[model samples]
Target: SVQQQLEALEKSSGGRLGVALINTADNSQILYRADERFAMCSTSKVMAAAAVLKQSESDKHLLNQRVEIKKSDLVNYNPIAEKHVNGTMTLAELGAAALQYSDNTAMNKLIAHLGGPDKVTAFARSLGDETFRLDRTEPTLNTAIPGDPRDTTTPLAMAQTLKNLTLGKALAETQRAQLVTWLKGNTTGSASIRAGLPKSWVVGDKTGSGDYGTTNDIAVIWPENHAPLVLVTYFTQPEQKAENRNDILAAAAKIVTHGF
Candidate 1:
């Protein structure tokens, strides 16, 4: 989950299913979805990350530059940064905290530094996603509120963004490498794409869940010796347990990329 942008993924678990997979090896889309709008949980961080990473390209020190942690800025979402109480860390460190840990406060701090929601959305658009937009920040709590339109994405838009990220266009090679490395270390999203692949396979992904109705996992999967695969799976079923729905999501991932 990237950002809590959508309220109702569908009426139930059987509701609208949005998933996409791209085989970077051949530059071909293996599967397709309607690309309709859906709420994004922490998955929205990828776009923000790209934006920040892009900025870092021109200014190599951007990631090393530090930001102060104010008393009021101490949000509960960033358990790691919260451990610091009050202090400072570089943007690169914050990026790692945000992606690897999916720390909300770490993300919010990055958002504040990257110029806010609109800029993040613009960055998404810059990646060639027309409908993908980011509006809200990580509120005191971690929900993307129903019908708020804060952070949302269309399957097509997200796929395109991944294209830019992997094709060496959206971000420079070095930054992209670093970002992917952090993504690989991500400890979240086990319920879906990350856990579905062959035991020998590895993936870099983010997972998102909310009391509202959104469960998401967007990943960059590396098949054994094969080209990388980009997979996005989102389910909106508040009625279902996170584990159950994620089980289904993971199953879907296996079925989709079966022959790998």
Candidate 2:
């Protein structure tokens, strides 16, 4: 089955691919060199968002708290437009824009509001994501002293985080609901988790991509007659092709729906 999927991806992407899928319930696994670490790109924002929400719920911080964005907050790989037609945004709005639109500007603002990337990293560490690393504020592959602003994570870690969120072990029920709603509002890209699932399915997910050969998504699929399942798919390769990336994810989705 793994080889067949690899062949399908190669046919579609016309290049090498790395893929991984795990069933959170039983620890059942499938992969084609999936244990390897890949630059997380914007996918790191999911955990960052979760950590922010966790802190907010614990401290009773209102989501409506407003924040300011400055020019220095700008970093590479940020998706938000610099030319603001408006002014400031609330914490809720920043979080929404970060997840829904994958806005870099919104994320930088939230990072600042959350006390910077160090705080977000500390929060993730506190949550038991030891293998994950947030090297900087923006996603960049500068291999220097601290390595780079680029983030890094494994497929397994992402799956575990999704499971944590779904089980309410990561945050309060209200905060989890807010995170899910934000994920549902994601509109930046398609061809992954959203492609194979039924239109009515409630999928809480985030997608990531970067110039350093990475494309991935982590999602919670709420299906009938079964416990809510977490699905994580990742691909890292030099090729620019995306169809194979999508195929790998689509195959993983099918495996979750039927193999589970």
Candidate 3:
């Protein structure tokens, strides 16, 4: 059974694993530790990007507004944002940088532009998700302290929020499409859920990494000839520093699809 397989996998991995799978076609769901909190890591990039798009709906120029990237904004994990220091990237570009590349600097800039982390939290609430929270900026947000509530969300909430942003009516049609396109082009999730999926299917995802061996992936999966499904996988080894096991996340995805 899927539950037994997942339980065995978690035991073997020596970590806590959380998964939430939602079938949009019929609204069926399967959950394991789905309501439990997990560090959101870079998966919160999707929220930052979504919030930017949400703001753009009321202001046509919001997405195109040019914002300067200062060197001070650079964090240790910013791959894409580092190059643009002292230059400028449009709001949309910053949003894409955070989602596609897990660029911490870009994410911070988005949060600042939107006024603060609270704005992103507000956006999540607007999507009808009360379980999502972003109480800090990057670097600090990635702390992933064991049982810490900061910058955390449940797998079920994360999955549902992704579904709302990508497939539901949370955002205007144009903005929603833009969010999906950005996620589809993400370069960081290749080894996670994407690794478990068949080539014939389509997927758009965001990946996150944090302390205590925490790794996460949230995806909108389009199975051939079927409506899309949303999956969220989060793993952590809180007792000790363990190597990241992206492969385990892949296995979780496989488990969900095996029962799909």
lDDT of each: 0.72, 0.66, 0.91
When sorted by lDDT, best at the front, the candidate numbers are 3, 1, 2
**Model 2 Cα shift for residue 260 (angstroms):** 5.7
TM-scores, all candidates, are 0.87, 0.81, 0.98
- Candidate 3, run of 10 with poorest lDDT: 236-245
Model 1 misplaced stretches (Cα beyond 4 Å): 1-12, 30-32, 140-148, 238-244
Q: Pick the candidate with the highest TM-score.
A: 3
Off by over 4 Å in 3: none
1 or 3, greater by lDDT: 3
Off by over 4 Å in 2: 7-27, 70-86, 139-150, 239-248, 255-260
